Design a protein around this motif. Structure first.
Motif, PDB file in Angstrom:
ATOM      1  N   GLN A   1      12.352  -6.752  -0.990  1.00 50.29           N
ATOM      2  CA  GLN A   1      11.991  -7.603   0.053  1.00 50.29           C
ATOM      3  C   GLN A   1      11.163  -6.679   0.828  1.00 50.29           C
ATOM      4  O   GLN A   1      10.946  -5.665   0.946  1.00 50.29           O
ATOM      5  N   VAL A   2       9.827  -7.716   1.225  1.00 52.83           N
ATOM      6  CA  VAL A   2       8.506  -7.234   1.762  1.00 52.83           C
ATOM      7  C   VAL A   2       8.329  -7.758   3.056  1.00 52.83           C
ATOM      8  O   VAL A   2       8.766  -8.975   3.448  1.00 52.83           O
ATOM      9  N   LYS A   3       7.580  -7.051   3.893  1.00 52.64           N
ATOM     10  CA  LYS A   3       7.031  -7.466   5.097  1.00 52.64           C
ATOM     11  C   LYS A   3       5.414  -7.875   4.829  1.00 52.64           C
ATOM     12  O   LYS A   3       4.793  -7.076   4.522  1.00 52.64           O
ATOM     13  N   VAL A   4       5.297  -9.026   5.211  1.00 51.29           N
ATOM     14  CA  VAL A   4       3.863  -9.382   5.195  1.00 51.29           C
ATOM     15  C   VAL A   4       3.025  -8.736   6.316  1.00 51.29           C
ATOM     16  O   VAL A   4       3.374  -8.849   7.561  1.00 51.29           O
TER      17      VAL A   4
ATOM     18  N   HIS B   1       0.927  -1.206  -0.072  1.00 52.22           N
ATOM     19  CA  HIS B   1       0.059   0.100   0.019  1.00 52.22           C
ATOM     20  C   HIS B   1       1.020   1.314   0.221  1.00 52.22           C
ATOM     21  O   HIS B   1       1.937   1.209   0.522  1.00 52.22           O
ATOM     22  N   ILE B   2       0.485   2.169  -0.775  1.00 50.03           N
ATOM     23  CA  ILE B   2       1.310   3.548  -0.683  1.00 50.03           C
ATOM     24  C   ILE B   2       1.685   4.132   0.503  1.00 50.03           C
ATOM     25  O   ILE B   2       2.962   4.523   0.615  1.00 50.03           O
ATOM     26  N   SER B   3       0.991   4.082   1.740  1.00 51.63           N
ATOM     27  CA  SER B   3       1.377   4.389   2.937  1.00 51.63           C
ATOM     28  C   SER B   3       2.336   3.660   3.554  1.00 51.63           C
ATOM     29  O   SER B   3       2.728   3.757   4.865  1.00 51.63           O
ATOM     30  N   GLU B   4       2.612   2.467   2.897  1.00 45.86           N
ATOM     31  CA  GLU B   4       3.588   1.538   3.672  1.00 45.86           C
ATOM     32  C   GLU B   4       4.890   1.482   2.558  1.00 45.86           C
ATOM     33  O   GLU B   4       5.770   0.553   2.796  1.00 45.86           O
ATOM     34  N   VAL B   5       4.799   2.178   1.372  1.00 44.01           N
ATOM     35  CA  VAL B   5       5.960   2.194   0.626  1.00 44.01           C
ATOM     36  C   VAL B   5       7.124   2.925   1.478  1.00 44.01           C
ATOM     37  O   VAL B   5       8.279   2.563   1.214  1.00 44.01           O
ATOM     38  N   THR B   6       7.004   3.988   1.837  1.00 41.39           N
ATOM     39  CA  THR B   6       8.065   4.671   2.652  1.00 41.39           C
ATOM     40  C   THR B   6       7.107   5.613   3.899  1.00 41.39           C
ATOM     41  O   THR B   6       5.890   5.554   3.874  1.00 41.39           O
ATOM     42  N   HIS B   7       7.805   5.869   4.932  1.00 37.31           N
ATOM     43  CA  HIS B   7       7.589   6.386   5.968  1.00 37.31           C
ATOM     44  C   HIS B   7       6.457   7.611   5.837  1.00 37.31           C
ATOM     45  O   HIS B   7       5.604   7.684   6.984  1.00 37.31           O
TER      46      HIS B   7
ATOM     47  N   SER C   1       4.471  -4.249   2.951  1.00 37.49           N
ATOM     48  CA  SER C   1       5.199  -3.126   3.379  1.00 37.49           C
ATOM     49  C   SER C   1       6.716  -3.226   2.806  1.00 37.49           C
ATOM     50  O   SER C   1       7.136  -4.215   2.647  1.00 37.49           O
ATOM     51  N   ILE C   2       7.144  -2.037   2.698  1.00 39.50           N
ATOM     52  CA  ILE C   2       8.669  -1.641   2.214  1.00 39.50           C
ATOM     53  C   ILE C   2       9.115  -0.681   3.257  1.00 39.50           C
ATOM     54  O   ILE C   2      10.233  -0.670   3.386  1.00 39.50           O
ATOM     55  N   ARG C   3       8.280   0.184   3.738  1.00 38.94           N
ATOM     56  CA  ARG C   3       8.853   1.037   4.972  1.00 38.94           C
ATOM     57  C   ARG C   3       9.190   0.201   5.856  1.00 38.94           C
ATOM     58  O   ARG C   3      10.450   0.343   6.631  1.00 38.94           O
ATOM     59  N   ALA C   4       8.935  -1.024   6.423  1.00 41.02           N
ATOM     60  CA  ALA C   4       9.279  -1.842   7.342  1.00 41.02           C
ATOM     61  C   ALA C   4      10.604  -2.482   6.894  1.00 41.02           C
ATOM     62  O   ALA C   4      11.469  -2.330   7.636  1.00 41.02           O
ATOM     63  N   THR C   5      10.879  -2.807   5.620  1.00 41.06           N
ATOM     64  CA  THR C   5      12.056  -3.527   5.207  1.00 41.06           C
ATOM     65  C   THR C   5      13.212  -2.645   4.881  1.00 41.06           C
ATOM     66  O   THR C   5      14.317  -2.895   5.163  1.00 41.06           O
ATOM     67  N   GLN C   6      13.082  -1.698   4.176  1.00 38.87           N
ATOM     68  CA  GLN C   6      13.965  -0.554   4.072  1.00 38.87           C
ATOM     69  C   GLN C   6      14.589   0.270   5.556  1.00 38.87           C
ATOM     70  O   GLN C   6      15.709   0.461   5.374  1.00 38.87           O
ATOM     71  N   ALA C   7      13.827   0.027   6.343  1.00 34.34           N
ATOM     72  CA  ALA C   7      14.057   0.586   7.763  1.00 34.34           C
ATOM     73  C   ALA C   7      15.042  -0.559   8.424  1.00 34.34           C
ATOM     74  O   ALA C   7      15.727  -0.261   9.410  1.00 34.34           O
ATOM     75  N   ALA C   8      14.936  -1.841   8.139  1.00 33.28           N
ATOM     76  CA  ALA C   8      15.612  -2.917   8.764  1.00 33.28           C
ATOM     77  C   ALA C   8      17.097  -2.892   8.295  1.00 33.28           C
ATOM     78  O   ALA C   8      17.429  -2.503   7.100  1.00 33.28           O
TER      79      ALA C   8
END
Length: 130
Positions: A59-62, A36-42, A75-82
């Motif tokens: 790499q994506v978070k479920v 979702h766009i709200s989950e692509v970046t913070h 999400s991708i904001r999740a994985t880019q932060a990791a």
């Protein structure tokens, strides 16, 4: 339909589309989800193409699973932060480059303002004065 993932898991897939509301990512031959766009970046996700690319690996978070259709919210904001393993991988060399990684033409890094002039020349060392 089917499911073989669970919320909070993290896996790798390839981006299959981009939209004004999110990015499609193929996870498997039997699984496909929607960052979702709200989950692509913070935040300040002004346009998705500035933050993701179709036909790239990610790499994506479920976030959620929808066994009714075998869809997944991602999400991708999740994985880019990791963090990750601080070791080389096939694309860390950034082989797509065609020029030296220099920040400037005047030297490898030459950021300035008082002499933000010239392009293939610079002032001499102060030792030029006698």
């Amino acid at each position: 339909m089917a499911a073989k993932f669970e919320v909070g898991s993290v896996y790798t897939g390839k981006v299959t589309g981009l939209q004004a509301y999110g990015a499609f990512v193929a996870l498997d031959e039997e699984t496909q989800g929607l960052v979702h766009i709200s989950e692509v970046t913070h935040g300040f996700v002004k346009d998705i193409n500035e933050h993701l690319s179709v036909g790239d690996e990610v790499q994506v978070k479920v976030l959620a699973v929808d066994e009714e259709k075998g869809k997944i919210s991602l999400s991708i904001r999740a994985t880019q932060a990791a963090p990750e393993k601080k070791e080389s991988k096939p694309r860390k060399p950034k082989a797509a480059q065609v020029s030296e990684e220099a920040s400037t033409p005047q030297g490898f890094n030459t950021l300035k303002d008082k002499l933000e002039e010239w392009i293939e020349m610079s002032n001499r060392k102060d030792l030029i004065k006698k």
